[PDB]
DNA sequence: CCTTGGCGGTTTTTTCGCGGGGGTCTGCGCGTTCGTGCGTTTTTGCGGTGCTTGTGCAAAAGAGCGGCCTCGGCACCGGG
């Protein structure tokens, strides 16, 4: 009995909604130079 | 200042949007494996100096010669 509960996802939107205050308040560019 | 067609209020009618309900599927979330970008050091190209290769601008005398001229000598025209 070693096993480990795992932490489940997000609902659909959550980590949507951290990501959109993330690029929001970050200016680089987010098209790769190279290509 | 004249004129009349049209806005406007009122009354019937008619019809489209939203909500509810239901169902479906498709991006979202996460895990795993793979790629190909940024970052360094190495390689090839443009340039300059030094060294190497080409080349223009005084009579005197004899011997020999070409042109030339007089001349020799001959054949020839004209006539019978």
């Given at each position: 009995?070693?096993?480990?509960?795992?932490?489940?996802?997000?609902?659909?939107?959550?980590?949507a909604?951290?990501?959109?205050?993330?690029?929001?308040?970050?200016?680089?560019l987010?098209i790769?130079?190279?290509?």
């Amino acid at each position: 009995t070693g096993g480990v509960m795992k932490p489940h996802r997000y609902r659909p939107g959550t980590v949507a909604l951290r990501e959109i205050r993330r690029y929001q308040k970050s200016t680089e560019l987010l098209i790769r130079k190279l290509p």
